[PDB]
């Protein structure tokens, strides 16, 4: 008859919530990250169909926390602009977006003060009949970004700790929700750029097959629709001004950087080819129509909200600014290049954190950024018109949706190497997932050997991960030891197989079924078997002592 046999290193897994670590004086690519692995091993799991859900992927929330945590830490040692909150006597420089302001500054010696001046943008100034104050003075103290930092969105690779694995959905037309017949396993993600933006997603990944439109629920007009493009659209933005910096000493080793202007003033703007955009829009509308088969499609401007939403926000590698994209989110489009006007802020409120504020220093000389539009965020108007037309608008604001637009292909699971199966006996990477239980047993070492040390503000995470990996490893080894199966990969025991545990044919089990399928059926009695196994060894130990005593 059949007996219990223990297998260690079987290719099965379950959804898990763990912590991933960062693989590369940048603001994001900090010194605490590890070197990347230049050769990812995309092992194809043929005959394995995993189900993904980008809308419940904890990786996104983890990413969000990571980005913020780093940001805050990076600006920790930077100058706090406390003494800046003084009476501002301002005049003019019709592009009157810049005001020349004078104020009283406290010198190195507390007993002494003097006059000083700086150029500020109207957007950063609040009327207090020509006296003003800095906008932040009634909310919090803005921290001046340290003069020697880099805000370039250097791509970050996420890697799993030993015992865990990252699955990829390689189905180029996957909607981000459902089965992925085309699935592979990797140790790390690719390099994803921490691009902070709204409306139009820049410098992201392009679709590999076609334009894909995905959402949590198209029937829910309170949710955002994410569209990923296959063909990129070039957009170039520039700030054609002599923003000469000035160094103002506001304390004992604390320098404030003020803006100055040498020449004249021209508004910043973006340049996007009309013909290009038009084509892209037409293509997107077509795909939308497929979901909304008997209606017209119209693109309009933002319904309203904070500047950060109504306009296109992005970091041009320098000073942050916002552009008016009403010329793009439209139905009437010209072939000629479209110029979009923009405005610049010195005082920036990151994300949606109240009380958080940073001040950006001026960059001497002009700036020009060449970037690609890779996708965008749209929302649909509620209700329905007799005109049988649906209206879509730009939106965003929650950076999690930006991260979600890149990490949607990844899923994190934990490997459960210990399995039990019925056999006819009595005692005395992960590619095998697609193989049958029998054949899969020939790769137990290949898998098991990589479940311990595969790894060889981020510091604490790496340390925690290391400990966890050890705990799990030892736990399993302890069990194998107790059951008298130490050092074995396939261990036949002295416990008989139950009839209530399975009614499957032995041949089907080993020749047809895979370990994943088996687990889902036999797991019902996991603890039952373990208990019996422990009792068996106890019996054996006393029997050995009995014999030894002779």
């Amino acid at each position: 008859n059949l007996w219990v046999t223990v297998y260690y290193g079987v290719p099965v897994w379950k959804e898990a919530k763990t912590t991933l670590f960062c693989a590369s004086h940048n603001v994001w690519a900090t010194h605490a990250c590890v070197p990347t692995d230049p050769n990812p091993q995309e092992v194809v799991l043929e005959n394995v169909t995993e189900n993904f859900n980008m809308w419940k992927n904890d990786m996104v929330d983890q990413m969000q926390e990571d980005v913020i945590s780093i940001w805050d830490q990076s600006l920790k040692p930077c100058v706090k602009l406390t003494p800046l909150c003084v009476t501002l006597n301002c005049t003019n420089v019709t592009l009157g977006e810049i005001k020349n302001c004078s104020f009283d500054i406290t010198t190195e010696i507390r007993d002494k003060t003097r006059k000083e001046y700086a150029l500020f943008y109207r957007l950063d100034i609040v009327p207090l009949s020509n006296t003003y104050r800095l906008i932040n003075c009634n909310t919090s103290t803005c921290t001046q970004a340290c003069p020697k930092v880099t805000f370039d969105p250097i791509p970050i690779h996420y890697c799993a700790p030993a015992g865990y694995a990252i699955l990829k959905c390689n189905n180029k037309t996957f909607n981000g929700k459902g089965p992925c017949n085309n699935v592979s396993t990797v140790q790390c993600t690719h390099g994803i750029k921490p691009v902070v933006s709204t409306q139009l997603l820049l410098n992201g990944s392009l679709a590999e097959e076609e334009i894909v439109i995905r959402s949590k629920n198209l029937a829910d007009n309170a949710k955002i629709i994410i569209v990923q493009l296959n063909k990129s659209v070039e957009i170039v933005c520039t700030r054609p001004n002599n923003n000469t910096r000035r160094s103002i000493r506001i304390g004992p080793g604390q320098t404030f950087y003020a803006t100055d202007i040498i020449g004249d003033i021209r508004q910043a703007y973006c340049n996007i080819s009309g013909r290009n955009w038009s084509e892209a829009v037409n293509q997107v509308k077509k795909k939308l129509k497929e979901h909304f088969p008997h209606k017209n499609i119209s693109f309009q401007s933002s319904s309203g909200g904070d500047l950060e939403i109504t306009t296109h926000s992005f970091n041009c590698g320098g000073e942050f600014f916002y552009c008016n994209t009403s010329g793009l989110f439209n139905d009437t489009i010209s072939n000629a290049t479209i110029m979009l006007p923009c405005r610049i802020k010195q005082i920036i409120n990151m994300w949606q954190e109240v009380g958080k504020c940073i001040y950006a220093p001026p960059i001497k000389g002009n700036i020009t950024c060449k970037s690609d539009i890779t996708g965008l965020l749209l929302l649909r108007d509620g209700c329905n018109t007799a005109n049988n037309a649906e209206i879509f608008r730009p939106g965003g604001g929650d950076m999690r949706d930006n991260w979600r637009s890149e990490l949607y292909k990844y899923k994190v699971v934990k490997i459960e190497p210990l399995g039990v199966a019925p056999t006819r006996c009595k005692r005395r990477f992960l590619g095998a997932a697609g193989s049958t239980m029998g054949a899969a047993s020939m790769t137990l070492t290949v898998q098991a050997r990589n479940l311990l040390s595969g790894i060889v503000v981020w510091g604490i995470k790496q340390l925690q991960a290391r400990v966890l990996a050890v705990e799990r490893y030892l736990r399993d080894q302890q069990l194998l030891g107790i059951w008298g199966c130490s050092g074995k990969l396939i261990c036949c025991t002295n416990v008989p197989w139950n009839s209530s545990w399975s009614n499957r044919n032995l041949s089907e089990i080993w020749d047809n079924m895979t370990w994943l399928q088996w687990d889902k059926e036999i797991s019902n009695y996991t603890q039952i078997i373990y208990g019996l196994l422990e009792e068996s060894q106890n019996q054996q130990e006393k029997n050995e002592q009995d014999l030894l005593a002779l």
Partner: antibody
Amino acid sequence: QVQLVQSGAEVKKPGASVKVSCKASGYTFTGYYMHWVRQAPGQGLEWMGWINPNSGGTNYCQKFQGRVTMTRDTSISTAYMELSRLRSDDTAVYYCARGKNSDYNWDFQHWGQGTLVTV
Amino acid sequence: EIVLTQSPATLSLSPGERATLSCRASQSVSSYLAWYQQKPGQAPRLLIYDASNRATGIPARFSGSGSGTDFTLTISSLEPEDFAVYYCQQYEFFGQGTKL
């Protein structure tokens, strides 16, 4: 507990505009979307739109586009709605409402007293 | 779009009895439904959500079920206090409701 407190009833002349406030308490103001819906005087309810206090983002019912606008002030946990070009058919009780869960926010578990507006 | 229809428009019922209220839609919405109680001069109150779950403070005798495009609210042990208007809701779409 939580509650929504709306302004009192108001009477305007046709063509004019009305402003209706709604103060929230008992929870994080920016935790959930605020919805506006009006109850017609002897008929079913008609959804107006909603606002997201985190960014002031809005979504208006198509049929009122260009007539209604919404905003907010987080410092006083108060939402605001305004309707211009008022008509006689706009007479209704405008309710301030909040959903139960941040995930499915259409479950309007929490309601204000409603504000009656006429011409 | 989604158009919700309920019936019977009105129901003259007595205490202790049982009755149900239908709700239909032209499109499948799985189970994302809600039912609201409406009394004269009062604010709307959530009764049932997900077409299965009772709202806070709602007695067990209030239930309902449905799927896809055909849903129904069920109320047992009817009371005089139930003589109100009940609405069927899906997303921003409100039905006409019925009166007991």
